[PDB]
Design a protein around this nucleic acid. Structure first.
Lengths: 78, 49, 157, 99, 398, 39, 90, 60, 57, 51, 51, 146, 103, 265, 145
RNA sequence: CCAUGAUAAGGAUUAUAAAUUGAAAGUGUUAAUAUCAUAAUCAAAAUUUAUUAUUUAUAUUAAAUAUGUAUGUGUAGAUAAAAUAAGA
C-alpha cells in the first residue's frame, strides 16, 4: 500500500515549569555561561521550523571560528 | 491477470479521517516526464522492406 | 442535487469554484470593456483623421455596443467575495481576516500554521520582520519596491 | 470592526441624505455631467417584463411624460414613484427613497 | 576632506546612480575578468538558504569542469588555426565591400591583411581562453573561494532573499475587535536565491545544452532560471529605414493623440515601391534621373533587359533616393459618362469595396442598376478604393 | 563526450587535489589556547 | 485529520517527517530515474493525423517530355492534392 | 529625494488628487490583468487541490 | 479510539520478518560494514567548555 | 516629401468607419452640440474627463 | 496659453486645486490591490536585475 | 542504465550547424538518416509540443501501455516498496539504539547480500512469491515472501 | 554503485555523479528552437501579420493593440445601428429639462 | 418516496439499447444508478438552466426573462411591468445576437474567446456537451440558449465541467476552434475554396501584383481560413524584386508547417 | 600614421564576419554599402519548472504564464560601437548624430549604452524583431543630423 | 447543528568586583467562544439596525454612490492601560 511506507517502528532507548531540565537550567549563570548553543559562527545555524530552537544544517560536526577565517587572522577578520 | 497491479489504496475505514496519512504519494521531482518516442513494431518492418 | 449527494462537508466550498468563473470572465472581457469605456468617455479628438461629429457618433455607437454586451464582466475586484478554498470562511482583503499570498482566511491560515501544513517562519508578533523593505518604510515601501521591480526598471521601448 | 477606506463590505449602508442645494449635482451622481446615462436607463435585449427598475437609474423627463409606472426596492416590499414630478430630473433613484 | 557638496548635485548623483543599473554592457573586448562574448546568469531558488548555497556550490563545480573541457577544445582549435590557415573568399569579399574606404577610395584588402586581422582576433581569443582556464584551475579543496571572480570560475554572487510577511488574526473565537487585534501573529514566506555567472569568450551550443539540462538534476525543492546575454549582429539598411529631409508640412500634436497610433500612424517601415512601370518617351538615362539613381545602379538592377520598351515593369535599385511610396496621397477619380459592375471592372476592384469606399453613391443608387446609372449624373466622379490608388513621381515630393 | 576526461584520465591527474578527509579533520581541529604561560 | 486529505507535496510535516527527507540534509538527488530510455513507447495520438493525404495516391510518374506534351490535357486531370472541376465525360 | 527614507529614484505617484480608473488616460496607461497573479489564482486556488493536476475519475 | 503504537520492541518483531531481516543484517555483515574516577569526572565536566559543547549541571 | 511616409491616409480609416459616414449623410447630422448653451458661463460645473 | 509654476504661496493656496477625497488609484498598482494586500504572482527577489 | 545514449542529444545541434554551414540534411545516407530520425525522436521537441506534453491523459496512457506490456517496475505511481532495511549494530558501543531520520527508495543492489552468503542460483532453484497476510499482524511485515 | 553504505551508514554525496548527470540529461528531450540561429534577418513586413492561430499576439497594455482597436472599431461600426445608438443621452441633455438646470 | 425529479428519459438510441442490454455494464461500485444532466426532460432542463444563472443571468426575477407575471415577496404580491410599458421610458438599443459575438481576430485579445455571453462557451465538445457533442454557433447566441453549450456552476453536473475548464492547457480555445473549423477535406483537396474569404484572397493577389507587399501582409493578417497557394505564390513573387529573403522565408514557413503545406509549391 | 590606421582599423562587415567565424556570433550580416552591421547584445529569461508544475495538466499553462512573464527582450548597443565608418565612406554616427540620438532616447540611453526593452509581444521571437525594427527607426531618425 | 481544539486573562529568578559594549520577556489554569473528527429538516444577498478607543474655529465636495446634525464654563459614576528610546 501507499501507507505501508509509514509503518517503520522506532525502538525505545535503553536506559541504565514544563519542558525544562531543573539540573541544567538551575546551574548558575555566571558559571554555565549565558549561552544556549555552542559558540560557533552563526552561519551554521538555521531557525528550525515548528520548533522553538535553532539546529545546524550540518548534523553535529561543529566547525570553530578559526575554520572560516584565514590562518592566524585577527579577530577572525578576512 | 498480471501480478503487478498491487492495491496501493488501503481498505476504507475511519483511519482516513482520524489520521494524517496522505492519500497519494508525493510527486517524484527527479522523474522525467513521460513522452512517446518508440516504434510500433511495424514501422521497423516497413523501413527494412 | 439538494443534499442527497455532495461528497463535501461544507457545501459553500462551491462558491470558490464559481468565483473562478468570474475571474475567467474578467480575463475575457477586461480589454473590450476598457477600450469601450475609454472611447466613450474621451472628449478630445481621437486623431487627425476623425474629429467632430464622426467622433461623437463613434462614441455613442461604442457605448451602445458596450451596453448591448450582455454578460460582460464589469465588476470592481474588491466587490468580489473572498472565501478560503478549504473551509469556506469569508475574509475581507486589507484586514487580518485574509492572507493575500495563501489566499485563505485567517482561521484557515492559523489552523495550517498550528499544524504542519504550511512552511512559514515565525517572527516577532509586534515587529517588521526580516525584510529590509518592511523595516525601512513598511507595507507601502515594500509595495513601491514590488512596483519598481515589476515595471519601473525596464526601458519600455 | 474596521474595514478598508471606501471598501465597506456593506453596499446598501450608504444613507443618501436630503439633497444639498449648493451642489445638488456633484453628490451621489456622475462626477461629470457630459457622461452618458448608465445602462439601467436602456433596454439591452427582448425581455418579458421588468419587475422593478433598479435604484441606480437616473430620472428623466420621459418618466413623468410617458406615465408608465416605476418602482424600486426599499425596506418595504416595493415602492412605486406615484405622482411623477419634474423637480427630480438628472438624479438617480437612490436619492429619493430615504431608507 | 572633509566632503562638502551641494544639494542639487547630490540629488542628481543619487538619482542617476539609481537609474543607471541595467545600462551595463556585459560582453566587451576588455581583457581580464570582464570582457567576453556570451554571459550566462543562472538564478537558483530554494526554500532554505543552506539548500540554495550547497546547490550553488555543486552547480559551480560542475560548470567549472564542463567549461574547462569546452574552453580546452576551443583553445586546441584556436592554436591549430593560428598555426596556419586559408583566408576564406567570402571573408575577403566581405572586407572588400566598402565603396569608399578610410582613405577616400576602394579598400584593396589582400589575403595577407585579412589573415593578419584574423590572427589578431585569434590571439585575443587564445588569451581569453587561457585566462578562463587558469581562473578555473584554481579552487582546490584545500582553499576554495567560490564567490571571488578572480579565484573561481564560474563564480557565484549573492542576492537578496524574497521575504513576505503575512499578518493575520489567530483567535478562532469571534470575540471583540480589540481581542482579535491583540491575538495577531506574524509569519513570513522566504525564498533564497543565488546567482552563478559564466562569461565565455565564445558562443558554445554544447555548453548551453549542458547548463540548460541542470534542471533535471537540481537539488530537492530547488528551481533555476536562465539569463542569456550574447552578442548579436543587427543589419541597418538605408532602404527600409532611409535618411531624408523632414516633410514640407511637419506633423503637429494632433497626430499624436489618444488612439491615434491605430488611426493615423502606419507601422514602420513604410512600403516603398521597388517595381516601376517605364513611361513613354523616357530614355535609359531619363529613367535613372527620374528615380534619383545612377545609370550603373539602374542597369545592375535590370541587366536582363538590354533596352527598356515604352511600357515595361523594371526593378528600381534598392538604394534609390527617389523611390515612391505605395498608396499615394492623391486620390484616384473615375469619371463615368457606367454601372457599378462596369466601374468595378474598369477599376479592377471588388464591387463591395467600391460601394463602401464611395459611400454616397450607395445612398443615392436605388435597387436597379439603371437607377444607379441615372444617379451617376448627380454622383459625378467616383472615388476609387484605396487599394487601387497609384503614386506619381511628382505627387510625393515637394 | 558528456564526461570530461579530466575526471578519469590519469594523464590529466591533479597533483594538488587532496583527499576528502584531511581538510575536514584539520579545520575541525581546535588547538589548545595555552601557547604561552600568561593569557 | 479531516475529510479533506492533506497534500503530501507542500506539507512541511510530511516533507520533513521520519519517512521523508529533512531539510538539514545535503538535499542531493535520491535516484537517477530513467524510464523512457529503458522502455520507450510509440506515438499514438487519439486524434487523427491532420496532415495525411486523406485519400488514395496514384504515383503519377510520367516522363517529363510527355508531361510537357500532354499538360493542356493534364490540367483537367487531378494533380497532387488538387481536384479540378472538369467533367469526367470530357 | 535622497533625504527621505522611502527614496527609490523613481516617481511612484502621479501627484493628481483627481485621478481614477474611469478616465481614459488611466485606461490607456494601465495594465491588463491577463496572465497575472489573478490568472494564477483563478486556476490554482481550487477548493480540491487534486483536480488541477488531473481529473479524479481518470486518476482513479 | 487510540491507535495501537506498541512502543515495546518485543511487540513489533515477528519471526517471519526476522527471517528476512537476519540475512541482510547480521553480526558478520555489521562487522564488515562498520569500523581515577574523580579525575575522569572532572575532565568530563571541563570538556564541556569546548567550542562544540556547553557547561551542563 | 509632402507628408510623412509612415502616415495613414484618410481613406484607410474611412474604410474602417464607412457605415458611420453613410448613416450621418443619410440622417443629415450637421452637428452634435456636446456642451449646453451657457456652458462657459459656469467654469466649474462642466468639467470634461480630460480637463 | 499656459502658466509656469507659481512662486508665491498665496497663488497655490487660493487657486482652484482639489484634494484627494477617494482611494488612491495607480495605473500600474491597480494590480497588487492595496498596501497590506500586496499581490505577487512570482516570488522573485525584490532587487531582481533583468538581463 | 546505459549512459552513452546521451551522445545522441547533440544531433540537433550538429544539424543546426549543418544548416548554418549550408550542408544539406537530405544529402546523407539512408541508414544514417534513419539513425538521425531515431535520435531526433528521442531528443527533439518544439515549444508547441512542450506546452501540451505530460498531460494527465498522456501520462496515464503511458502507464496503461506499460501495464499492457508488463513493465510497471520503474513507474512512480505504480511502484510499491514492500521491503525495508534495518540498521547495523556496531560491536563498539552496543548499548545505544538507533532510529531512522529519513527514508529513501534506493535500489536493491546497493545493500544486496554477498553472493557467498546467499543460496546459489536462487532465481531458478527456488520460486519466491511476495504476498500479504490475510490475518491481522501486531508485529508487522504486512507483505511477506514465501 | 560500488558504495554499499549509501544510506545505511549515511554516506550522502554532496556532488551528483557523472553517471546520474548523464542519465538525467538523456531522460528528457531538447527544445529544437532553444538553439539560436538566424542568417536571413528580420521580417520587416512580416513575422507579425501571420496567421491568426500563430499570430504575434500583443500583451499587457492597450497601446500595443493598434490592430485590435481597428478591428473592434470596424466591427462595432458594422454591427450597431445609429438609429439605436442615438438614444444614449448625456447628463446635461437630461438635466436641460430641470427647473434649475444650472447654478 | 422523496424523488427530486418525477420523470426521466434515456439517451441511447432505441436500436442499440435493446441489443446492448445483453452485455453487462460495469457501473460505479459506490453509485451504480447514475442520473446525469442529459437524462432530464426538456422542461426540467430548461428550468434548471434558467435557475443556474441566478446571480448574473436571467435566474433573478427582476433580471428578466422570468416569464412570471407576479412576484410574491414580503407577503405582498406585485405585478410585473411589461416590456411595452417599460420601453416608453427606457429607450431600446437592442442590436441582437450580432453584438455578443466578436470577430475571430479578437480571440487572442479576449483570451481565446469570441462570444461575450454570461456563460463561458467552450469550443471543445466535452464541457458544454449535453448528450450530443458541444457545438457553439455564433449566429444563434441567445440568452435562452437552446443548446446548453455554456458553462455555469449551478447545474446538476457542473463541478466536473468547471474542473475540466479550469484544467485546460494553453491555446486550448484557439486550438479547438481552429481544428474544428478548418480541416482537410475527405477528397484530399485543400480547404481553400471558401466564398466568405475569396474576395480577400483576390484583393491580396491584386496588392501583391501591384507590389504593395505591406498592404498584402496587413490584409493577410485578418484572414480566418487557409489561403490558396496563389496567395503565397504572389507574395513570394512580389518579395523577389526587393531581395527580402527574410520576408520570403517567413511567408513560406507560415504556410508550410502550419497550414497543411499549402506553400509547398 | 596611415600605415598604423590601415593595420589597426577593421571595417564593420569585416569585424562582424570575423566574429561570426571564430567566436560563433549569430546574426545576419549585410555586404551592401547601404547596410551597416551594428554590434549589439540581447538579454532574456528562460525558465522551466521542475518542482510541482511538470508532468501534469497545469504544467502547460504554468509554462505559458512563465514565458509570457519573461517575454521581455533587452537589446543593448554601444555608441562607441556605432561610431564607425559605413559602406559609403563616412562615419555612421557623428557628434551631432550622437547628440540627436541621445535627445531622441531620453531615458533609453544611459552610460553610453542604448538599451531598448521590448515587452510588445507575448514571445521573445517577436519581441526581438519589434526591438530591431524600433532601433532601426531610431537610427534612421537620428542619422538625419 | 461538528464538540472539540486554539485563544483570552496571565504571573516565575540568577548574573561579586574588575573588563567588555557588553552577558539577558516567560507560562499553568480557570473562563468564554467557536467555522474541526463525531447525533436529517434548513443565515449570507432584498442588508435599517442600533456592533469601545473619531477630524473643535485664517482659507473647507474633481473622477467607482461616498454622510445635515450633539456649539453650550469641557463639568459625574464606573472601566481599561503602562514602569519597554526615552527622560516617577
Amino acid at each position: 500500500y501507499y501507507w505501508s511506507r509509514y509503518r517503520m517502528p522506532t525502538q525505545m532507548p535503553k536506559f541504565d515549569n514544563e519542558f525544562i531540565d531543573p539540573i541544567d537550567d538551575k546551574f548558575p549563570m555566571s558559571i554555565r555561561g549565558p549561552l544556549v548553543r555552542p559558540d560557533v559562527p552563526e552561519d551554521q545555524y538555521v531557525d528550525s521550523w515548528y520548533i522553538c530552537t535553532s539546529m545546524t544544517h550540518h548534523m553535529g560536526d561543529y566547525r570553530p571560528w578559526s575554520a572560516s577565517a584565514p590562518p592566524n587572522a585577527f579577530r577572525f577578520r578576512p | 491477470m498480471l501480478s503487478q497491479n498491487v492495491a496501493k489504496t488501503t481498505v476504507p475505514s475511519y483511519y482516513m479521517i482520524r489520521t494524517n496519512l496522505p492519500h497519494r504519494k508525493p510527486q517524484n521531482q527527479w522523474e522525467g516526464v513521460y513522452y512517446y518516442s518508440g516504434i510500433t513494431k511495424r514501422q521497423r518492418h516497413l523501413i527494412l522492406l | 442535487m439538494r443534499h442527497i449527494g455532495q461528497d463535501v462537508p461544507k457545501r459553500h466550498t462551491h462558491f470558490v469554484l464559481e468565483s473562478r468563473l468570474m475571474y475567467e470572465k474578467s480575463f475575457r472581457d477586461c480589454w473590450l470593456h476598457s477600450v469601450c469605456r475609454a472611447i466613450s468617455q474621451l472628449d478630445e479628438p481621437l486623431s487627425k483623421t476623425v474629429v467632430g461629429t464622426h467622433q461623437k457618433m463613434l462614441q455613442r455607437k461604442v457605448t451602445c455596443f458596450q451596453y448591448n454586451q450582455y454578460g460582460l464582466f464589469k465588476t470592481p475586484y474588491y466587490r468580489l467575495a473572498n472565501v478560503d478554498r478549504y473551509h469556506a470562511v469569508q475574509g475581507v482583503a486589507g484586514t487580518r481576516e485574509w492572507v493575500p499570498y495563501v489566499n485563505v482566511s485567517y482561521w484557515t491560515m492559523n489552523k495550517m500554521v498550528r499544524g504542519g501544513n504550511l512552511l512559514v517562519h515565525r517572527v516577532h508578533y509586534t515587529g517588521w520582520g526580516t525584510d529590509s523593505h518592511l523595516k525601512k518604510g513598511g507595507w507601502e515601501h515594500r509595495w513601491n519596491k514590488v512596483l519598481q521591480r515589476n515595471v519601473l526598471q525596464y526601458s519600455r521601448i | 470592526r474596521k474595514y478598508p477606506f471606501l471598501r465597506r463590505p456593506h453596499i446598501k449602508n450608504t444613507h443618501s441624505m436630503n439633497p444639498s442645494a449648493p451642489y445638488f449635482w456633484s453628490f451621489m451622481t456622475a462626477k461629470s455631467q457630459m457622461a452618458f446615462l448608465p445602462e439601467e436607463n436602456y433596454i439591452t435585449g427582448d425581455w418579458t417584463g421588468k419587475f422593478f427598475v433598479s435604484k441606480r437609474q437616473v430620472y428623466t423627463l420621459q418618466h413623468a411624460t410617458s406615465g408608465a409606472k416605476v418602482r424600486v426596492k426599499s425596506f418595504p416590499s416595493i415602492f412605486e414613484f406615484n405622482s411623477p414630478s419634474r423637480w427630480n430630473i438628472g438624479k438617480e433613484m437612490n436619492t429619493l427613497t430615504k431608507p | 576632506f572633509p566632503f562638502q557638496w551641494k544639494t542639487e548635485d547630490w540629488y542628481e548623483y543619487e538619482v542617476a546612480k539609481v537609474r543607471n543599473r541595467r545600462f551595463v554592457f556585459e560582453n566587451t573586448e576588455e581583457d581580464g575578468i570582464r570582457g567576453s562574448e556570451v554571459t550566462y546568469k543562472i538564478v537558483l531558488e530554494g526554500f532554505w538558504d543552506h539548500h540554495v548555497m550547497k546547490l550553488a556550490e555543486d552547480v559551480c563545480m560542475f560548470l567549472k569542469d564542463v567549461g574547462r573541457q569546452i574552453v580546452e577544445e576551443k583553445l586546441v582549435a584556436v592554436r591549430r588555426l593560428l598555426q596556419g590557415g586559408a583566408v576564406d573568399p567570402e571573408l575577403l569579399a566581405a572586407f572588400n565591400c566598402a565603396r569608399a574606404g578610410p582613405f577616400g577610395g576602394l579598400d584593396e584588402y589582400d589575403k595577407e591583411e585579412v589573415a593578419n586581422f584574423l590572427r589578431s582576433d585569434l590571439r585575443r581569443l587564445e588569451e581569453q581562453c587561457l585566462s578562463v582556464i587558469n581562473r578555473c584551475n584554481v579552487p582546490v579543496p584545500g582553499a576554495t573561494n567560490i564567490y571571488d571572480p578572480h579565484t573561481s570560475w564560474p563564480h557565484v554572487e549573492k542576492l537578496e532573499p524574497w521575504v513576505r510577511m503575512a499578518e493575520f488574526w489567530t483567535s478562532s473565537s469571534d470575540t471583540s475587535f480589540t481581542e482579535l487585534e491583540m491575538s495577531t501573529a506574524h509569519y513570513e514566506f522566504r525564498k533564497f536565491f543565488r546567482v552563478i555567472i559564466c562569461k565565455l569568450p565564445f558562443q558554445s551550443t554544447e555548453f548551453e545544452k549542458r547548463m540548460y539540462d541542470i534542471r533535471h538534476w537540481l537539488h530537492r525543492q530547488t528551481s533555476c532560471e536562465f539569463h542569456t546575454i550574447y552578442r548579436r549582429n543587427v543589419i541597418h539598411d538605408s532602404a527600409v529605414f532611409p535618411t531624408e529631409h523632414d516633410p514640407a508640412t511637419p506633423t503637429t500634436h494632433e497626430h499624436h493623440r489618444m488612439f491615434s497610433f491605430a488611426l493615423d500612424w502606419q507601422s514602420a517601415p513604410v512600403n516603398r515601391l521597388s517595381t516601376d512601370t517605364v513611361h513613354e518617351g523616357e530614355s535609359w538615362d531619363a529613367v535613372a534621373q527620374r528615380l534619383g539613381c545612377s545609370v550603373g545602379e539602374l542597369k545592375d538592377a535590370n541587366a536582363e533587359r538590354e533596352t527598356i520598351e515604352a511600357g515595361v515593369v523594371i526593378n528600381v535599385p534598392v538604394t534609390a533616393t527617389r523611390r515612391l511610396t505605395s498608396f499615394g496621397a492623391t486620390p484616384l477619380v473615375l469619371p463615368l459618362k457606367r454601372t457599378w459592375e462596369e466601374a468595378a471592372a474598369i477599376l479592377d476592384c471588388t464591387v463591395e469595396e467600391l460601394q463602401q469606399c464611395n459611400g454616397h453613391a450607395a445612398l443615392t443608387y436605388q435597387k436597379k442598376e439603371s437607377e444607379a446609372g441615372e444617379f451617376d449624373s448627380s454622383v459625378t466622379e467616383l472615388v476609387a478604393p484605396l487599394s487601387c490608388w497609384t503614386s506619381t513621381s511628382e505627387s510625393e515630393f515637394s | 563526450a558528456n564526461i570530461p576526461r579530466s575526471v578519469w584520465d590519469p594523464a590529466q591527474h591533479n597533483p594538488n587535489w587532496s583527499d576528502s578527509y584531511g581538510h575536514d579533520i584539520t579545520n575541525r581541529r581546535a588547538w589548545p589556547a595555552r601557547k604561552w604561560t600568561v593569557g | 485529520v479531516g475529510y479533506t486529505p492533506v497534500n503530501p507535496d507542500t506539507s512541511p510535516m510530511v516533507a520533513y517527517s521520519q519517512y521523508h527527507w529533512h531539510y538539514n540534509l545535503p538535499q542531493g538527488m535520491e535516484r537517477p530515474h530513467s524510464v523512457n530510455r529503458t522502455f520507450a513507447a510509440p506515438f499514438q495520438s487519439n486524434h487523427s493525423l491532420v496532415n495525411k493525404y486523406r485519400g488514395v495516391w496514384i504515383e503519377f510518374d510520367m516522363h517529363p517530355a510527355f508531361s510537357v506534351a500532354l499538360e493542356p490535357q493534364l490540367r483537367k486531370l487531378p494533380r497532387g492534392r488538387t481536384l479540378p472541376k472538369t467533367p469526367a465525360e470530357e | 529625494s535622497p533625504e527621505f527614507k522611502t527614496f527609490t529614484g523613481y516617481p511612484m505617484r502621479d501627484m493628481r488628487p483627481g485621478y481614477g480608473q474611469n478616465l481614459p488616460d488611466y485606461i490607456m496607461k494601465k495594465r491588463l490583468p491577463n496572465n497575472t497573479h489573478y490568472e494564477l489564482f483563478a486556476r490554482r486556488d481550487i477548493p480540491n487541490e487534486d483536480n488541477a493536476m488531473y481529473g479524479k475519475y481518470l486518476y482513479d | 479510539n487510540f491507535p495501537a503504537h506498541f512502543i515495546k520492541s518485543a511487540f513489533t518483531t515477528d519471526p517471519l520478518k526476522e527471517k528476512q531481516k537476519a540475512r541482510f543484517s547480521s553480526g558478520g555483515e555489521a562487522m564488515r560494514e562498520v569500523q581515577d574516577t574523580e579525575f575522569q569526572a572532572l575532565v568530563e565536566f571541563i570538556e564541556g567548555a569546548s567550542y562544540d559543547q556547553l557547561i551542563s549541571g | 516629401r509632402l507628408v510623412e511616409p509612415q502616415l495613414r491616409p484618410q481613406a484607410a480609416t474611412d474604410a474602417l468607419l464607412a457605415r458611420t459616414i453613410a448613416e450621418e449623410e443619410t440622417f443629415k447630422l450637421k452637428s452634435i452640440p456636446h456642451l449646453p448653451q451657457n456652458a462657459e458661463r459656469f467654469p466649474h460645473e462642466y468639467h470634461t474627463p480630460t480637463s | 496659453v499656459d502658466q509656469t509654476p507659481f512662486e508665491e504661496d498665496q497663488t497655490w493656496l487660493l487657486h482652484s486645486i482639489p484634494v484627494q477625497q477617494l482611494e488612491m488609484h495607480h495605473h500600474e498598482k491597480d494590480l497588487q490591490d492595496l498596501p497590506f494586500i500586496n499581490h505577487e504572482q512570482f516570488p522573485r527577489s525584490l532587487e531582481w536585475n533583468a538581463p | 542504465a546505459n549512459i552513452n545514449v546521451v551522445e545522441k542529444k547533440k544531433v540537433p545541434l550538429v544539424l543546426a550547424q549543418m544548416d548554418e554551414l549550408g550542408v544539406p540534411r537530405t544529402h546523407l545516407s539512408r541508414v544514417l538518416m534513419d539513425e538521425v530520425e531515431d535520435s531526433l525522436r528521442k531528443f527533439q521537441t518544439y515549444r508547441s509540443r512542450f506546452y501540451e506534453w505530460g498531460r494527465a491523459v498522456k501520462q496515464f496512457d503511458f502507464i496503461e501501455f506499460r501495464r499492457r506490456n508488463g513493465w510497471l517496475y520503474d513507474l512512480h505511481l505504480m511502484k510499491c516498496t514492500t521491503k525495508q532495511v534495518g540498521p547495523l549494530r556496531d560491536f563498539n558501543d552496543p548499548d545505544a539504539v538507533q532510529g531512522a531520520v529519513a527514508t529513501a527508495e534506493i535500489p536493491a543492489f546497493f545493500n544486496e547480500r554477498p553472493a557467498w552468503e546467499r543460496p546459489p542460483l536462487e532465481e531458478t532453484l527456488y520460486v519466491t512469491t511476495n504476498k500479504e497476510r490475510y490475518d491481522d499482524v501486531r508485529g508487522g511485515d504486512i507483505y511477506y515472501d514465501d | 554503485s560500488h558504495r554499499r553504505d549509501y544510506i545505511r551508514m549515511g554516506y550522502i554525496p554532496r556532488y551528483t555523479p557523472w553517471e546520474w548527470i548523464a542519465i538525467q540529461e538523456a531522460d528528457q528531450p531538447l527544445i529544437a528552437e532553444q538553439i539560436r540561429q538566424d542568417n536571413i534577418g528580420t521580417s520587416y513586413f512580416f513575422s507579425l501579420n501571420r496567421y491568426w492561430r500563430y499570430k504575434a499576439s500583443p500583451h499587457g497594455y492597450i497601446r500595443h493593440f493598434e490592430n485590435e482597436v481597428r478591428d473592434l472599431l470596424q466591427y462595432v461600426d458594422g454591427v450597431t445601428p445609429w438609429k439605436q445608438a442615438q438614444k444614449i443621452r448625456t447628463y446635461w441633455e437630461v438635466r436641460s429639462h430641470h427647473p434649475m438646470p444650472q447654478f | 418516496v422523496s424523488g427530486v425529479f418525477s420523470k426521466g428519459r434515456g439517451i441511447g438510441h432505441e436500436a442499440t439499447t435493446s441489443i446492448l442490454r445483453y452485455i453487462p455494464r460495469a457501473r460505479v461500485p459506490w453509485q451504480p444508478s447514475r442520473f446525469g444532466r442529459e437524462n432530464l426532460t426538456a422542461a426540467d432542463m430548461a428550468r434548471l438552466w434558467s435557475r443556474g444563472r441566478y446571480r448574473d443571468g436571467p435566474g433573478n426575477y427582476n433580471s428578466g426573462y422570468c416569464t412570471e407575471r407576479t412576484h410574491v415577496l414580503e407577503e405582498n404580491t406585485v405585478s410585473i411591468i411589461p416590456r411595452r410599458e417599460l420601453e416608453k421610458y427606457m429607450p431600446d438599443i437592442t442590436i441582437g445576437p450580432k453584438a455578443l459575438v466578436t470577430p475571430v481576430s479578437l480571440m487572442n485579445a479576449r483570451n481565446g474567446h469570441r462570444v461575450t455571453h454570461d456563460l463561458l462557451h467552450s469550443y471543445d465538445p466535452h464541457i458544454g456537451r449535453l448528450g450530443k457533442p458541444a457545438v457553439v454557433d455564433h449566429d444563434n447566441i441567445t440568452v435562452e440558449d437552446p443548446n446548453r453549450v455554456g458553462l455555469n456552476a449551478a447545474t446538476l453536473d457542473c463541478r466536473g465541467r468547471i474542473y475540466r475548464w479550469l484544467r485546460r492547457g494553453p491555446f486550448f480555445q484557439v486550438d479547438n476552434y481552429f481544428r474544428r473549423s478548418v480541416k482537410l477535406n475527405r477528397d484530399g483537396t485543400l480547404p481553400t475554396d471558401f466564398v466568405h474569404e475569396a474576395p480577400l484572397m483576390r484583393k491580396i493577389i491584386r496588392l501583391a501584383h501591384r507590389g504593395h507587399l505591406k498592404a498584402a501582409c496587413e490584409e493577410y493578417r485578418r484572414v480566418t481560413t487557409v489561403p490558396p497557394v496563389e496567395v503565397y505564390r504572389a507574395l513570394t513573387a512580389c518579395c523577389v524584386p526587393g531581395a527580402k529573403l527574410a520576408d520570403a522565408v517567413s511567408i513560406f514557413e507560415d504556410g508550410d508547417s502550419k497550414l497543411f503545406y499549402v506553400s509547398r509549391d | 600614421m596611415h600605415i598604423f590606421i590601415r593595420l589597426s582599423y577593421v571595417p564593420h562587415a569585416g569585424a562582424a564576419t570575423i566574429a561570426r567565424l571564430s567566436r560563433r556570433r549569430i546574426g545576419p550580416i549585410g555586404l551592401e554599402p547601404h547596410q551597416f552591421n551594428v554590434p549589439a547584445e540581447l538579454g532574456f529569461v528562460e525558465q522551466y519548472d521542475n518542482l510541482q508544475y511538470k508532468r501534469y495538466d497545469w504544467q502547460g499553462w504554468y509554462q505559458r504564464m512563465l514565458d509570457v512573464h519573461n517575454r521581455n527582450v533587452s537589446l543593448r548597443c554601444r555608441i562607441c560601437d556605432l561610431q564607425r565608418l559605413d559602406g559609403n565612406g563616412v562615419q555612421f554616427v557623428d557628434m551631432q548624430t550622437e547628440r540627436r540620438l541621445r535627445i531622441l532616447a531620453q531615458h533609453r540611453v544611459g552610460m553610453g549604452v542604448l538599451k531598448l526593452d521590448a515587452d510588445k509581444y507575448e514571445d521573445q521571437a517577436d519581441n526581438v524583431t519589434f526591438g530591431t525594427t524600433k532601433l532601426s527607426e531610431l537610427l534612421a531618425d537620428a542619422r538625419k543630423a
